[PDB]
Amino acid sequence: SKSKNILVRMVSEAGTGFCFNTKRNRLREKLTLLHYDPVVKQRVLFVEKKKIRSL
Amino acid sequence: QKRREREQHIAECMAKMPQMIVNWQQQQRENWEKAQADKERRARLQAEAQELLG
Amino acid sequence: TVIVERWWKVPLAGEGRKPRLHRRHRVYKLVEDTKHRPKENLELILTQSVENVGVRGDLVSVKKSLGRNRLLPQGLAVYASPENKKLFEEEKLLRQE
Amino acid sequence: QDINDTVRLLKEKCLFTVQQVTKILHSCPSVLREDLGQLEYKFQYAYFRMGIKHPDIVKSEYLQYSLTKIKQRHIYLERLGRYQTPDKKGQTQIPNPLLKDILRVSEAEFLARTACTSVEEFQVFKKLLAREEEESESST
Amino acid sequence: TEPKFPAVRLALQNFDMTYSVQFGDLWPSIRVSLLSEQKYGALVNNFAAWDHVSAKLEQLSAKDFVNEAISHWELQSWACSPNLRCFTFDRGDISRFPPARPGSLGVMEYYLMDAASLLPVLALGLQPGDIVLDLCAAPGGKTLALLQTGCCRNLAANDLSPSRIARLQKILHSYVPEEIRDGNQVRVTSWDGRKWGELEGDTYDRVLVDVPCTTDRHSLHEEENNIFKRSRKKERQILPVLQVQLLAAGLLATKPGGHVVYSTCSLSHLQNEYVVQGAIELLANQYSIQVQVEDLTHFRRVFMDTFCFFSSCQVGELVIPNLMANFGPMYFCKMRRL
Amino acid sequence: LTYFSARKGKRKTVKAVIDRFLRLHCGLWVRRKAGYKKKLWKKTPARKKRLREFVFCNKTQSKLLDKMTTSFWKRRNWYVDDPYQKYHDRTNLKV
RNA sequence: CUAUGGAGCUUUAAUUUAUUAAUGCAAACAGAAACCUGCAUUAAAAAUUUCGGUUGGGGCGACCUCGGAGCAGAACCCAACCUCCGAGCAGUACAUGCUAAGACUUCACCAGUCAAAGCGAACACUCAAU
Ligand SMILES: C[S@@+](CC[C@H](N)C(=O)[O-])C[C@H]1O[C@@H](n2cnc3c(N)ncnc32)[C@H](O)[C@@H]1O
Ligand SMILES: [Mg+2]
Ligand SMILES: [Mg+2]
Numbered sequence: 065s066k067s068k069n070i071l072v073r074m075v076s077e078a079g080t081g082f083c084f085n086t087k088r089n090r091l092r093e094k095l096t097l098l099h100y101d102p103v104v105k106q107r108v109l110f111v112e113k114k115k116i117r118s119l
Numbered sequence: 120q121k122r123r124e125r126e127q128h129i130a131e132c133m134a135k136m137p138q139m140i141v142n143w144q145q146q147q148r149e150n151w152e153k154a155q156a157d158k159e160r161r162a163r164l165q166a167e168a169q170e171l172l173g
Numbered sequence: 174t175v176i177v178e179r180w181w182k183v184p185l186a187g188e189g190r191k192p193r194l195h196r197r198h199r200v201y202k203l204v205e206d207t208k209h210r211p212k213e214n215l216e217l218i219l220t221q222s223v224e225n226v227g228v229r230g231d232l233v234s235v236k237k238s239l240g241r242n243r244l245l246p247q248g249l250a251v252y253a254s255p256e257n258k259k260l261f262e263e264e265k266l267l268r269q270e
Numbered sequence: 271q272d273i274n275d276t277v278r279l280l281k282e283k284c285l286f287t288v289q290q291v292t293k294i295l296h297s298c299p300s301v302l303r304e305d306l307g308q309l310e311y312k313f314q315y316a317y318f319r320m321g322i323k324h325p326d327i328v329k330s331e332y333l334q335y336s337l338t339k340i341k342q343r344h345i346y347l348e349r350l351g352r353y354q355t356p357d358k359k360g361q362t363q364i365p366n367p368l369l370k371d372i373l374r375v376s377e378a379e380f381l382a383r384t385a386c387t388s389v390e391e392f393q394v395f396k397k398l399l400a401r402e403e404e405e406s407e408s409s410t
Numbered sequence: 411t412e413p414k415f416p417a418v419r420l421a422l423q424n425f426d427m428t429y430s431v432q433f434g435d436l437w438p439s440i441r442v443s444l445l446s447e448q449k450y451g452a453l454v455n456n457f458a459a460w461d462h463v464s465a466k467l468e469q470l471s472a473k474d475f476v477n478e479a480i481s482h483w484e485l486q487s488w489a490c491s492p493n494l495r496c497f498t499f500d501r502g503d504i505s506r507f508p509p510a511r512p513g514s515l516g517v518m519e520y521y522l523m524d525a526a527s528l529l530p531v532l533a534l535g536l537q538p539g540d541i542v543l544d545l546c547a548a549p550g551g552k553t554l555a556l557l558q559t560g561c562c563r564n565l566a567a568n569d570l571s572p573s574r575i576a577r578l579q580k581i582l583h584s585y586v587p588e589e590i591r592d593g594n595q596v597r598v599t600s601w602d603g604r605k606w607g608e609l610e611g612d613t614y615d616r617v618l619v620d621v622p623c624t625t626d627r628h629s630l631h632e633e634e635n636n637i638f639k640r641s642r643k644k645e646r647q648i649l650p651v652l653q654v655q656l657l658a659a660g661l662l663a664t665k666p667g668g669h670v671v672y673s674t675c676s677l678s679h680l681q682n683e684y685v686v687q688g689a690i691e692l693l694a695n696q697y698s699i700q701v702q703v704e705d706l707t708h709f710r711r712v713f714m715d716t717f718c719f720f721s722s723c724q725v726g727e728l729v730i731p732n733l734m735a736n737f738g739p740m741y742f743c744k745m746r747r748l
Numbered sequence: 749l750t751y752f753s754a755r756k757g758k759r760k761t762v763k764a765v766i767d768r769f770l771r772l773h774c775g776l777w778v779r780r781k782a783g784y785k786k787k788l789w790k791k792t793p794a795r796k797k798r799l800r801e802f803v804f805c806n807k808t809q810s811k812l813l814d815k816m817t818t819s820f821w822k823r824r825n826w827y828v829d830d831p832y833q834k835y836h837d838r839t840n841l842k843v
Numbered sequence: 844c845u846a847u848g849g850a851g852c853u854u855u856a857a858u859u860u861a862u863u864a865a866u867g868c869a870a871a872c873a874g875a876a877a878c879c880u881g882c883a884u885u886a887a888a889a890a891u892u893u894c895g896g897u898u899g900g901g902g903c904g905a906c907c908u909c910g911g912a913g914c915a916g917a918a919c920c921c922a923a924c925c926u927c928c929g930a931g932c933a934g935u936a937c938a939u940g941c942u943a944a945g946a947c948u949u950c951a952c953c954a955g956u957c958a959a960a961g962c963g964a965a966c967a968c969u970c971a972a973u
């Protein structure tokens with residue numbers, strides 16, 4: 065029951081405060097995705113901020 | 120005041136958002152190119168090893 | 174002095190009626206013990222010469238453990254009551270005259 | 271108060287006779303300097319994992335030695351198979367090496383007579399046991 | 411916890427009772443090494459930045475014992491399986507390799523495996539453009555080495571347990587790039603190993619059989635699913651029959667002139683040598699198949715510098731655990747089918 | 749359930765149902781979905797969408813809550829700017 | 844054999860130090876000390892309560908959730924105990940966004956599943972369980 069992946073939180077770089085949770089490999093770099101922001105009604109960058117839990 | 124500060128912060132971030140997006144895409148493309156260049160270098164080293172074997 | 178507070182809320186009784194107490198209202202929690210609080214200084218007026226202050230009529234704040242055991246019991250000092258301070262300012266005025 | 275606490279630990283927690291406590295104080299004076307927790311750990315290690323009794327420990331002066339070297343040599347012999355911890359019945363399938371030989375002699379003589387192994391192997395085991403002990407302390 | 415007589419203690423008692431007469435005066439050192447932590451070796455992923463990770467390990471002061479053995483091959487004088495890199499620390503060292511990190515290629519740099527497990531792969535003597543069978547492949551400690559060698563166009567790895575099959579597939583996804591495994595170059599399956607003698611007879615050139623066995627190192631530490639449990643006593647008793655059947659099945663599967671490497675992670679002669687002898691006798695009796703066990707003394711002498719061998723083995727070669735070199739326990743026999 | 753209180757001799761109300769359920773004056777009961785805030789990272793967007801809705805209760809549960817709550821909660825209210833004001837009455841309902 | 848019925852005894856069963864004793868700090872004096880009070884740490888001696896089911900010996904073990912096969916041949920359901928193999932994951936996107944007709948459902952409920960159109964983008968993710 066080893067935990068290969070962890071759940072981490074991505075916040076928008078647009079400053080809207082929007083954020084969402086996604087799973088990633090522990091042995092990996094911090095993620096910088098391009099995700100839709102409902103506040104600005106378009107797609108913006110999201111950077112990893114905090115590790116939530118291991119799964 | 121709080122609403123205005125929120126709006127101006129959003130505007131300031133979105134002003135430079137396209138530059139951040141294009142810089143990130145350029146960084147990803149350069150990382151992929153560097154990885155492929157390392158693949159080619161590894162293939163060259165394998166060819167050199169084959170030359171040494173022969 | 175120990176101070177306690179009930180763990181459970183007591184329902185309001187109103188005016189002129191005593192509250193109704195329950196067994197759960199006997200459960201208390203220790204808010205604070207006064208004996209562990211920082212000490213204070215007792216303020217008094219001297220009558221004779223003392224080592225700290227040797228002039229009669231000077232208001233001095235000294236530790237209670239000494240003021241209550243040496244100065245007051247032996248008559249070496251008196252309380253800083255308004256009557257006492259008035260009577261001492263009277264003799265101060267007489268001296269200045 | 272420190273001496274009172276130490277002697278109360280010896281008499282009540284460790285359950286030593288008064289004469290045994292007097293002999294321990296006379297023979298191993300570093301016990302007073304030693305803290306209570308480590309002393310109790312040493313005594314219970316000897317009592318359970320080695321199966322030695324109060325007269326034997328007070329006669330062999332086990333408490334004066336370093337817990338680190340005691341652990342190293344005892345665990346080395348136990349993993350070798352030379353030392354077998356006494357069971358519930360008190361019986362041991364093999365004879366046990368004497369406490370005097372395991373502790374009081376040098377490392378060279380200890381390896382030559384009991385371990386019958388190489389000094390390099392002993393040093394490697396010392397490193398491994400130190401790592402295991404520090405990992406156990408971190409886990410606890 | 412368990413009520414009475416835990417499986418680890420039962421395994422230790424059995425090993426004492428047997429090896430005290432099976433080994434003589436090596437049992438103390440063997441027991442100490444088994445009870446102590448094992449040394450790890452770093453297998454370089456040749457598909458990744460092998461040169462960079464080799465530089466990193468050499469800065470970590472690890473040495474390429476495989477390259478040292480390659481140098482000593484001619485010094486002592488089928489050669490061995492080429493294109494392999496494994497790094498271990500000096501004799502008596504306790505330093506451990508840091509956990510592997512992904513490279514720029516997306517595949518992890520190296521795999522931490524027991525060095526003795528790499529000996530059967532080297533003894534198998536792989537050649538370019540070969541066909542490889544791997545019985546009891548999962549979790550894939552040796553199949554990873556086979557793929558790092560990369561001398562096999564078709565590799566057929568089989569293991570009965572779906573859980574270990576899934577673990578092997580995860581390892582393959584982590585290490586091997588997807589383009590190699592997309593085709594039929596790698597075929598991972600979950601079926602009984604005794605079937606291959608009829609499913610594919612005289613088909614595969616190189617075959618590696620690592621039968622299930624009472625692994626002493628795992629038995630003395632792990633307390634979950636041990637061969638020395640009371641529920642598994644029947645399996646432990648029946649184990650030699652399964653081992654000899656699997657070896658016979660592998661010998662049937664391999665082609666005439668092909669090579670078979672039988673390996674086991676234990677020290678008992680009953681499950682090391684008698685299994686091989688029973689397999690060859692069964693081949694002679696039932697199916698009239700002849701095999702020749704090759705001599706691996708030349709193989710042993712090269713690695714005597716960084717490995718400890720027992721010099722009283724009738725057929726194969728056995729590496730015993732030691733404090734200076736905690737690799738093992740391992741045993742392997744190489745045989746060509748005629 | 750307290751059918752007769754010891755201080756007033758009148759039926760009491762369970763506060764769990766009051767805290768968990770909303771009653772419309774027409775007789776319907778509106779509730780939440782169990783687990784609409786639990787482990788959302790392993791649930792599909794459609795599943796979360798249907799989990800974060802407000803649903804009605806059937807006849808048996810409605811009668812149970814009717815018995816477990818007193819008549820004060822079944823009165824008609826005239827709150828100013830009530831989100832559920834239009835849902836208190838049924839329209840075009842036959843039998 | 845049953846009771847989500849008792850009681851006695853034991854203990855490294857769960858929850859406590861109310862109590863006693865010994866320490867430490869605070870308080871109070873002396874100048875150091877003792878008694879008392881409060882707050883903490885140790886023990887000692889105790890107080891309340893409890894024995895989840897299956898496998899009939901009994902131990903020794905195993906089992907309790909979900910998926911598949913032997914299991915009801917052709918809409919659905921249906922063999923409990925039993926025999927066996929697995930699962931309590933992984934991998935790829937980052938619109939794996941937002942709302943909304945009409946439906947299915949493991950025989951109740953709780954849950955669970957599919958989905959037209961519409962807004963917004965581009966030119967309802969694979970997997971039996973997980
Ligand atoms: C000892 S492990 C070998 C692991 C791997 N080959 C290595 O060297 O690192 C053998 C595995 O084969 C599987 N196995 C057992 N019996 C088998 C059989 N009869 N046929 C195929 N695989 C079997 C078991 O699940 C066991 O985990
Ligand atoms: Mg019942
Ligand atoms: Mg009670």
Ligand SMILES: [Mg+2]
Nearest residue numbers: 948949950951
């Ligand atoms: Mg239904």
